[PDB]
Amino acid sequence: AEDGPQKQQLEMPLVLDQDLTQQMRLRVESLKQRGEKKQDGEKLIRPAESVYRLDFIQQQKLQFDHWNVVLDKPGKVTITGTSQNWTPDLTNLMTRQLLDPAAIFWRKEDSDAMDWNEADALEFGERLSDLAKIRKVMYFLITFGEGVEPANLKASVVFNQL
Numbered sequence: 001a002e003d004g005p006q007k008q009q010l011e012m013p014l015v016l017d018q019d020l021t022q023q024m025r026l027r028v029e030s031l032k033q034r035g036e037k038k039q040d041g042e043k044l045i046r047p048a049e050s051v052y053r054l055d056f057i058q059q060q061k062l063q064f065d066h067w068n069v070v071l072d073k074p075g076k077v078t079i080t081g082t083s084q085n086w087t088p089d090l091t092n093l094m095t096r097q098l099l100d101p102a103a104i105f106w107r108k109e110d111s112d113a114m115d116w117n118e119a120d121a122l123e124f125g126e127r128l129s130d131l132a133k134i135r136k137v138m139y140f141l142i143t144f145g146e147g148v149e150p151a152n153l154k155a156s157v158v159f160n161q162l
């Protein structure tokens, strides 16, 4: 197997889930509004976090090839996955449903080139292939570091068709 471009691939984007990202925003507010307290080991979405959705156009015969994450302005972003068992409509996201490691990308003031934590990013990347089989859709929580926003990001995953 001599790697190259001739191989067939599938790029699947991480679309911003505004409805779901909003649902979690209320939740945090509701609890302040009602001076109420959150469940045990519950994950409350933060202002710097937004929920993203990844739709697996294919589930079988997948091999993680590489992440395709680009920031158009100097900053940092963390892509953390959620359990393929987490039912966003039925239950509140629990801290234990956040996957590890998270894939972290960044760009600096003098570079137009992205750098990241290769190891962890690959670990995470590898898992995605087997997660595609649990269910057709998957969600992630993307934490935008200071200076960046959803407008500045283009995230996707490239898989090799087997």
Ligand SMILES: [Zn+2]
Binding pocket: 017, 018, 019, 020, 053
């Ligand atoms: Zn949605």
Ligand SMILES: [Zn+2]
Binding pocket: 039, 040
């Ligand atoms: Zn408690």
Ligand SMILES: [Zn+2]
Binding pocket: 065, 066
């Ligand atoms: Zn490649």
Ligand SMILES: [Zn+2]
Binding pocket: 003, 004, 065
């Ligand atoms: Zn390759």
Ligand SMILES: [Zn+2]
Binding pocket: 100, 101, 123
């Ligand atoms: Zn690890």
Ligand SMILES: [Zn+2]
Binding pocket: 101, 120
């Ligand atoms: Zn690590």
